[PDB]
Amino acid sequence: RGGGLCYCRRRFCVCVGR
Amino acid sequence: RGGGLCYCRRRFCVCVGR
C-alpha cells in the first residue's frame, strides 16, 4: 500500500511523499 | 518559516519541519 516518509533529527525535520 | 510546512508539487509531495 502507499504511505508517507518522515525523517527527524536534531532541530530539523523533513518528510517526502509521492 | 514558523511551525511546519508541507505541500505537494508536480508528481511528488515535499514537506519540511523545523
Curated annotation (Swiss-Prot), chains A, B:
The modification Arginine amide is found at R18. It is found in: Secreted. Microbicidal activity. Active against E.coli, Listeria monocytogenes and C.albicans, in vitro. The gene is NPG3. This is Protegrin-3. Belongs to the cathelicidin family. The chain holds residues 131 to 148 of 149 of the full protein. It comes from the Eukaryota. Disulfide bonds join C6-C15, C8-C13.
